[PDB]
Amino acid sequence: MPAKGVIQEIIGVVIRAKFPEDEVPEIYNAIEIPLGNGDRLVCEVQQQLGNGVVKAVAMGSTDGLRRGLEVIDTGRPIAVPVGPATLGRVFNVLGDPIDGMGPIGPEVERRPIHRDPPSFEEQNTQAQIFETGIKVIDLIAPFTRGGKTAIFGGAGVGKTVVIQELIANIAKEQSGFSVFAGVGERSREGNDLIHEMKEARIDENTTVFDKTVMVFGQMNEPPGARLRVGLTALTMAEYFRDEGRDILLFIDNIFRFVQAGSEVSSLLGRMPSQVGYQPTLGTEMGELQERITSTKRGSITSMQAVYVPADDYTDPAPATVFSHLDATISLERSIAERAIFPAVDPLASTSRILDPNIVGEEHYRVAQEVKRVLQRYKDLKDIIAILGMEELSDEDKLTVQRARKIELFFSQPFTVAQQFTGRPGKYVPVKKTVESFARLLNGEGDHIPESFFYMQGDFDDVLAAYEASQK
Amino acid sequence: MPAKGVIQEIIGVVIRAKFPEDEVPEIYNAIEIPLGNGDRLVCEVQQQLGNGVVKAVAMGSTDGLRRGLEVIDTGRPIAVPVGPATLGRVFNVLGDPIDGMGPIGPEVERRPIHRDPPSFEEQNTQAQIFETGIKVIDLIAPFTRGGKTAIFGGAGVGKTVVIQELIANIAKEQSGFSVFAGVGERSREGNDLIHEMKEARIDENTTVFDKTVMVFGQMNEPPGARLRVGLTALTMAEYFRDEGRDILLFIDNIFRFVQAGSEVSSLLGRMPSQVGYQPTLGTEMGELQERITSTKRGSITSMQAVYVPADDYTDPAPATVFSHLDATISLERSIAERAIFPAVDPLASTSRILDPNIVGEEHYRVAQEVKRVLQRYKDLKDIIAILGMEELSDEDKLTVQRARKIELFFSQPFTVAQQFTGRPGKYVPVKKTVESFARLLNGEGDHIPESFFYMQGDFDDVLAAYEASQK
Amino acid sequence: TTITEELIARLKQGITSGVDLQPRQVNVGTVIAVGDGVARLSGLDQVVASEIVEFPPKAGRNESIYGIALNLEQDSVAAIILGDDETIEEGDMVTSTGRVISVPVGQGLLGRVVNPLGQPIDGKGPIVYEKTRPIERIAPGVITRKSVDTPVQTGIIAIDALIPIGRGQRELIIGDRQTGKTAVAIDTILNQKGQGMVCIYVAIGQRRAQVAQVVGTLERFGAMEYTIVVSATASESAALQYIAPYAGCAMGEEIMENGVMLNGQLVKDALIVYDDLSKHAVAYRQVSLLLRRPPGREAYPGDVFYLHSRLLERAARLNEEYGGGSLTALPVIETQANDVSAYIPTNVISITDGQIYLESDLFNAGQRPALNVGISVSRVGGAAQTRAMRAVAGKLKGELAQFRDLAAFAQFASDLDATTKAQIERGQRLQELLKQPQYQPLPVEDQVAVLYAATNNYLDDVPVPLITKWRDDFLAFLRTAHPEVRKLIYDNRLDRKFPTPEVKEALEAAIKEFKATSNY
Amino acid sequence: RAVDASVTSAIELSAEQKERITRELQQRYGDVHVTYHVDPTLIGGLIIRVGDQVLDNSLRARLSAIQRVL
Amino acid sequence: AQAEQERIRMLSEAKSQIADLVTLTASRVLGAELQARGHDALIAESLAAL
Amino acid sequence: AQAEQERIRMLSEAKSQIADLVTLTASRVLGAELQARGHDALIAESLA
Ligand SMILES: Nc1ncnc2c1ncn2[C@@H]1O[C@H](COP(=O)(O)OP(=O)(O)OP(=O)(O)O)[C@@H](O)[C@H]1O
Ligand SMILES: Nc1ncnc2c1ncn2[C@@H]1O[C@H](COP(=O)(O)OP(=O)(O)O)[C@@H](O)[C@H]1O
Numbered sequence A, B: 001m002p003a004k005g006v007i008q009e010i011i012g013v014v015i016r017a018k019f020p021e022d023e024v025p026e027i028y029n030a031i032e033i034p035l036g037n038g039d040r041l042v043c044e045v046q047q048q049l050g051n052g053v054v055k056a057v058a059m060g061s062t063d064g065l066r067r068g069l070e071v072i073d074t075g076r077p078i079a080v081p082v083g084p085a086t087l088g089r090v091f092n093v094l095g096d097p098i099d100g101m102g103p104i105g106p107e108v109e110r111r112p113i114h115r116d117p118p119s120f121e122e123q124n125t126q127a128q129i130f131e132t133g134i135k136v137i138d139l140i141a142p143f144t145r146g147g148k149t150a151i152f153g154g155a156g157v158g159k160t161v162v163i164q165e166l167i168a169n170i171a172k173e174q175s176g177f178s179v180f181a182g183v184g185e186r187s188r189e190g191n192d193l194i195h196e197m198k199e200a201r202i203d204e205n206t207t208v209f210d211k212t213v214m215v216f217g218q219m220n221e222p223p224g225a226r227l228r229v230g231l232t233a234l235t236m237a238e239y240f241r242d243e244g245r246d247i248l249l250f251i252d253n254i255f256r257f258v259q260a261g262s263e264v265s266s267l268l269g270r271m272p273s274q275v276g277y278q279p280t281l282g283t284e285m286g287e288l289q290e291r292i293t294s295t296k297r298g299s300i301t302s303m304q305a306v307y308v309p310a311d312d313y314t315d316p317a318p319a320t321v322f323s324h325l326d327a328t329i330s331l332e333r334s335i336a337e338r339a340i341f342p343a344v345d346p347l348a349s350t351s352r353i354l355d356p357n358i359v360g361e362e363h364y365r366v367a368q369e370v371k372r373v374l375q376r377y378k379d380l381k382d383i384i385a386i387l388g389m390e391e392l393s394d395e396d397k398l399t400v401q402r403a404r405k406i407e408l409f410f411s412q413p414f415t416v417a418q419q420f421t422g423r424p425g426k427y428v429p430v431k432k433t434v435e436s437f438a439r440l441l442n443g444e445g446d447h448i449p450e451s452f453f454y455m456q457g458d459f460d461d462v463l464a465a466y467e468a469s470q471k
Numbered sequence C: 001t002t003i004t005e006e007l008i009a010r011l012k013q014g015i016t017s018g019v020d021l022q023p024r025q026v027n028v029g030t031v032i033a034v035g036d037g038v039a040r041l042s043g044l045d046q047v048v049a050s051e052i053v054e055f056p057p058k059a060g061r062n063e064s065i066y067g068i069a070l071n072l073e074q075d076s077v078a079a080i081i082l083g084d085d086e087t088i089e090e091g092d093m094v095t096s097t098g099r100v101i102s103v104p105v106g107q108g109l110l111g112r113v114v115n116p117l118g119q120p121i122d123g124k125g126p127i128v129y130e131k132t133r134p135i136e137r138i139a140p141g142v143i144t145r146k147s148v149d150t151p152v153q154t155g156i157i158a159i160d161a162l163i164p165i166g167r168g169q170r171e172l173i174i175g176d177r178q179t180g181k182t183a184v185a186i187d188t189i190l191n192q193k194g195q196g197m198v199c200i201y202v203a204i205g206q207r208r209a210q211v212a213q214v215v216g217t218l219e220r221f222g223a224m225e226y227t228i229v230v231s232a233t234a235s236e237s238a239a240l241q242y243i244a245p246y247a248g249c250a251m252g253e254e255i256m257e258n259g260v261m262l263n264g265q266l267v268k269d270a271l272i273v274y275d276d277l278s279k280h281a282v283a284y285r286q287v288s289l290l291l292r293r294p295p296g297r298e299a300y301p302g303d304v305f306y307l308h309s310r311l312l313e314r315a316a317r318l319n320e321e322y323g324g325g326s327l328t329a330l331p332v333i334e335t336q337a338n339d340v341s342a343y344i345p346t347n348v349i350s351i352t353d354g355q356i357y358l359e360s361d362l363f364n365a366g367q368r369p370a371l372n373v374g375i376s377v378s379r380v381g382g383a384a385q386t387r388a389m390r391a392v393a394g395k396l397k398g399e400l401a402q403f404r405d406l407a408a409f410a411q412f413a414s415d416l417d418a419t420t421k422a423q424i425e426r427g428q429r430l431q432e433l434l435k436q437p438q439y440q441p442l443p444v445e446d447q448v449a450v451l452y453a454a455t456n457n458y459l460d461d462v463p464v465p466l467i468t469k470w471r472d473d474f475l476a477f478l479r480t481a482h483p484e485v486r487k488l489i490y491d492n493r494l495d496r497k498f499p500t501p502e503v504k505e506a507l508e509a510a511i512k513e514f515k516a517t518s519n520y
Numbered sequence D: 001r002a003v004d005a006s007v008t009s010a011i012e013l014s015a016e017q018k019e020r021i022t023r024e025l026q027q028r029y030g031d032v033h034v035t036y037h038v039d040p041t042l043i044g045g046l047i048i049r050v051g052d053q054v055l056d057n058s059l060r061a062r063l064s065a066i067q068r069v070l
Numbered sequence E: 001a002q003a004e005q006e007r008i009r010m011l012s013e014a015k016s017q018i019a020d021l022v023t024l025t026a027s028r029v030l031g032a033e034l035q036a037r038g039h040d041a042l043i044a045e046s047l048a049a050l
Numbered sequence F: 001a002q003a004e005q006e007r008i009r010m011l012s013e014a015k016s017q018i019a020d021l022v023t024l025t026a027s028r029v030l031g032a033e034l035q036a037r038g039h040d041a042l043i044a045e046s047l048a
């Protein structure tokens, strides 16, 4: 479809292009406006308003465009490069590398942004745990293969730190790739800091950055770009999924994807729905998070970060996000103030895979009893702070001691990210977490003071440090 | 008569009139519709729709109009009389005298309603305190010369009475003139109860009415009249500002101006903003307020009453005026029902001019200490509600007594309040009120009971009352 | 030869054969409709989006009022009038200037109050310049930036110790009504007297009197030697208020990319304050609704998150490859009854790196900077602090968090045990320490010394209502009796182990000497 | 639709000159309406506004010269 | 340095001033010549320029 | 003061102003047929 049209209307980041009566571009067909030299503006067709007129979102500056400019139809949605050539590179919404390196090249396979999800036959009937290395994540709210996990928290609780240490864990300890979709990524927070963090984490002769793809829909971009960056990262990850690999896509803020969709719908003149949101919120979430599944060939596990507006979990954006979630990891500022870097609240982190018949019979006894002990501590904390531990009877003093031990034991140094409290790499497996927490839950740790459990290992590091200090 | 057109549409108080294409009226022009009684209907243009068609706000009944009526363009915006001829008269939005006196002659100067505000380099940054006759206004929230000051309260708290009392005080005890803008003026508050209350003799044969200008954009007027009455009063006061005189401007209500703007915008078919309000709310408020400034030549100093429904200060009407204020007087119904008729709350009544570098160190010290003791009493009255004052007090008895004495001493009998009470009015200079509060603050009033502070002038009046009782 | 011969040699080239006297069919537009600051033009097909149009002078109007062609609809150009809408009439000629909006930039704008178009409004003569920078440009990008390391010293102890602001960091100041947002911004501007940083103040939608008072405050403290004051007041059209912050940040990006000679030193660091982004968003909402663009939540247009983001993502910290300069943004947001979850507040909070929350409850309680430490964050953190402040303020942060956990027990402290009462008293003394008078910023050495005195057990003797006075007196002591202690603290403020025994012993001796010779 | 020609002479144009202007400007659409203005600021020549197109003759050269020299 | 820059600015101002003077006086003498020579030549030339 | 000497520098108006005006009026904006005299008095009176 080499059809050439002309720009008819320009209203903000929403343009209209008049084409011939035949060969009109389809919906999501990525028209392109040359701007001189090699620069071009890639718009995405959203509506067909009659005789050859298509309404599209700019996905670019569109601040120097005149009416009547030539527009080239591409005949397909936005084409982004896929393959090993995308590893170690940073892309915008259009798949153009926004790092210092040059273009990808014409010999690299390009794929459309808008694909269909895996069919009904391709879905995996039986779920499977995804080991991630983190103690609290693998124990309390375990991941699922081809599933969605959402991390919550405040502005500075450490969600991005958790995301990047998970990227490092996936890249270094196992030979697996990951794709990071920085939707609404600040040009300071992610466009240099995350690159430095990924290029600082090194295993041998290569970095964690070398085993991950990055697609940055920065905040300065128009709402269409921040809307389509998630699908761009999905397209770049589905290649490795088609090779049978287990990709773990990360999403910087799925709420900013929702807000980009709402802004795009408002700019197109559509009637608002719910709390001023787009009418197509459910379908827009489905077209993204139904491509994150466990195919019979390969799998895409995903980890989103969700911003909850006004701490309202019944808000339509968290309501629609929660419909697709398989696990939740709640970060609390209170835990962060106690110098706990993995500030995961085990009493607020859930997972659908936490079942006796999937993650193990001992898993859904150790996790259940750990949660019960922590709930007992949460109940008794006010009494302890007001009165003191002397009022607590037996079976409650021991419970509080074990609860403090596990609460301080959930902390990890994230030695892969920088070298803060650096120590030999552990990457504690799921079975090791189960065995350590069953060990402490069955006593065997009461002689340890409640200060050794800090950035520790697998409860064998705890006893090793106890023997080293004084034994 | 630059142009003559015909009425095309009459929709309520909106007139669409078709003019010759080479003689279309300007944006803020005034167009007269001659009626079959020797009078005319003056509409204000607001838009130029297409080829020679203009949309105008009626500023009249439009219950005698038919399609095809002749419409004479005046070429310029609404022209209102200025000069000494307007002094002592009552006008409306069109500048026509609505009192029983004769019409204004054609020899007077007539100025357009819409004028640019004074430029940035004409601003006089020298802050000067304007002497009001009110004790609490002088002490707590001093009146700034050339600045804009607001009164906030519910219904019946005393805003209009306070405004007319300042008119009487600053015209009698000072030579400053006054211009009154009855925006949305009730026909009971404006047609009576202010004309009669301005029949207060100044020296021998001149009343406050003879030295003041009144422009009543009454409530039964269409929304355009109530929208432009404030600008009419500003145009009338700007002549006295340009003569070098320090002119006083009282806008009897601000939220009615906002309501008139909202109604005008809704009637014109403009897109609604915020909660159904006008999109040009900030611009209209700025256009009104920025003409009230202190210049090198003269200074318009203004007091504007604002009615907050319930206690909602986040409504668009008080929120859009907060940026334009130099001082706020917060009237309270609780203080009014306690027979403290000048029901100013000393707390939550701020002023930018309340600075030791401007009003002096003694004024600042006295005001700050009075606010401190009143704040202490705000808790001590609760404390003594159950535990009697005689039961226990560590200097609490003395500070409670002093605070009760000063909160009664803030009450002042008004000249215009003789109808309500019969007590003759009192005027206190700004020096005498701060001196009296300094004297009462540290001793010298602990023996006089809290009955001789009720309705008095300076502390000398309280003393004279005390030794008049003890005869 | 004479220099006038060189002057004539410059002439007689364009004078003789340098002018093209060719008449060409230039495409102009005719006005078909004028609204409320929006004028629609019939045919102007040679216009780009956001291009400044002229409206050339006509009969009865000797000046041209420019506009911004925003809506390039089919056979229609809706342009928002920058000046006054009264003069524009139907049928008026409109000539396309062929240029996007640009503002003068460079050394000449230093101490000048200017329009968003760059025209001076201070009445101090024309702006001297040789370069114009475009209003709208893309942010520096991905590889251009650098991690924020250099601190911006606001002078407020609470901000500089708990909510660090670094060069290239977008730190929102969000408050409500009169809580001191402009006071905090002006205090930050006044503290850059010799810090090698050029300040810019935008003041969108304010009073002319308020901007005049701000300029007077700046020029009475000598701050106008390095400050640019853009101004789009409330009476001015919504187009000027819409383009004001972009003009300010264009000047800031000129400072960042090239730099100016300040005090004989090249300065490439700029601190910009958008004193009302809520008012800027209101002005753009008025522009969009008057253009009949489809509204969204709270009647704001769809591209209102985009609006501010273009503005705020231009504040960067460039690496040494791209000059090493930086632009620091200090947006100001006014909430309504502390409605943090409103549209524009959430937009700016998500965009900005950190937030500074000002509460009316603290402002009316005597806290002179009404700063809410509990909810306000700076995600750059310790990287935006000196090593001295990093070493000292950690215990301050911990003690203040402990006090905020126990703030409900403050009036009951006389009835509690020893450790809880001690924590409450320490928190009260620290909160009284953070109170600062207006227009009195403190240098980093003074803040470090005061916070070291407070962090260690030295303010326990002096009672709470005198803490502030103590601080003032101590500073006077350090300003008179021991300048060497202040110089020593300032000299090794970048040392990784800041409390070296030399500076530690000097500071302890100064504190002991002050305490022994003073009574409270 | 009889586009409004906006001819502005240098100082004044003769009646036969005005008739020649009308006899030449009819090539744009039909015999469209032409309005003649004085505009004494113009030194020589005249400015012709046929609809949405403008063809200035002289005076503009002065501005073009001064923007080339200044 | 500021004095040198002010001298340069004054020289540029003098150049702009003589440019304004020569343009204005050329316009005046052109008005005088169009008072002498008829306007018909320029009118015909502009009409042919359409 | 040394900068304000431009005036003394500008007492050489005869070499520049007359020639530039003559070549501007004739050689660039018309067909170089400025034979009609009488404008010399105007340029002498107006350039001072
Ligand atoms: N630290 C302080 N100590 C004492 N007074 C202060 C302090 N900061 C501000 N003020 C006072 O409070 C007033 C209001 O502060 P400011 O004008 O900065 O607030 P704002 O949030 O910008 O308000 P506005 O909505 O009026 O623009 C100041 O004029 C000043 O008198
Ligand atoms: N100074 C005063 N003395 C006595 N009564 C007063 C005084 N001020 C107000 N009032 C009471 O308030 C009423 C007028 O209130 P008004 O000012 O019209 O209300 P608003 O403040 O809503 O305009 C009167 O009926 C009177 O009883």
Ligand SMILES: [Mg+2]
Pocket (backbone or CB within 6 Å): B159, B160, B189
């Ligand atoms: Mg009233």
Ligand SMILES: [Mg+2]
Pocket (backbone or CB within 6 Å): C181, C182
């Ligand atoms: Mg402010």
